[PDB]
């Protein structure tokens, strides 16, 4: 996260770290959506152009974390993966369309002060909140700048950007399964997700019921925090039918 700040303790209790076993390293962010399901970006697991193709046994999920590198004894819980599900129409060849994957844990994780699931949006909450100017929140342990790495989880609040501005900022073909967020050059404020924040949540707090909803997944961007560029996020609600289908048949 570039131009963010240290998260407060328990600020993002759905935050998940995807952790590579060997070598031991951060692979991506992710989010907890139930006691046995974790949501992330497909590109965290599968990206053939960079020879990335992770299997279940390659990975661990670490939940309840704050410190990036420490083993947070008595606080974090580490889970093994039973199975990975990548969207069958994930477009890694072109523009990361449908950049979404689910991971089923071998065992349910116990909720605590530091571990708690985020809500997925309904059509109505999505329609109400996914509007240009409305701010969401992105969290992660990724790079502090494009070209170092934070001691603890970082947080930044960023405004959703009008679709035409998103489109006009890039040569990449944008789809309805993506939205973009960040400040415009004229707006002065800045901030962005970056490498390593991949797969983490873009959340909004509903003013109707005071619950946090995951509207987006950190997907892609051209560099990090560049003037005139925006961060792109998987549109979770647009892909919710797939999410429910996977959980309904395998959960």
């Amino acid at each position: 996260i570039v131009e963010g700040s240290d998260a407060e303790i328990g600020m993002s209790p759905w935050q998940v770290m995807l952790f590579r076993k060997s070598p031991q390293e951060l692979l991506c962010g992710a989010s907890l959506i139930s006691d046995r399901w974790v949501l992330t970006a497909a590109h965290c697991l599968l990206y053939p152009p960079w020879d990335k193709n992770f299997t279940e046994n390659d990975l661990l999920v670490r939940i309840g974390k704050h410190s990036r590198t420490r083993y947070e004894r008595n606080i974090e819980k580490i889970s093994m993966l039973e199975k990975i599900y990548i969207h069958p129409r994930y477009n890694w060849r072109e523009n990361l369309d449908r950049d979404i994957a689910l991971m089923k844990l071998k065992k349910p994780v116990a909720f605590s002060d530091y571990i708690h699931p985020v809500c997925l949006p309904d059509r109505e909450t999505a329609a109400s909140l996914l509007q240009a100017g409305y701010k969401g929140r992105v969290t992660g342990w990724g790079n502090l700048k494009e070209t170092g790495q934070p001691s603890v989880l970082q947080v930044v609040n960023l405004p959703i950007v009008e679709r035409p501005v998103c489109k006009d900022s890039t040569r990449i073909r944008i789809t309805d399964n993506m939205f973009c967020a960040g400040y415009k050059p004229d707006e002065g404020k800045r901030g962005d997700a970056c490498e390593g924040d991949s797969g983490g949540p873009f959340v909004m707090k509903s003013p109707f019921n005071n619950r946090w909803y995951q509207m987006g997944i950190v997907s892609w961007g051209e560099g990090c925090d560049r003037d005139g560029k925006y961060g792109f996020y998987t549109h979770v609600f647009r892909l919710k039918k797939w999410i429910q289908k996977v959980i309904d048949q395998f959960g």
């Binding site: 328990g10 985020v118 100017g133 909803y213």
Partner: peptide, 28 residues
Amino acid sequence: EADCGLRPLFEKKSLEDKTERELLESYI
């Protein structure tokens, strides 16, 4: 799921985090 999105250290005890008001203020 019934309890989703309500943080034990914040919503569950009616404490606000330092910047959530920034979000609310943007929801016009």
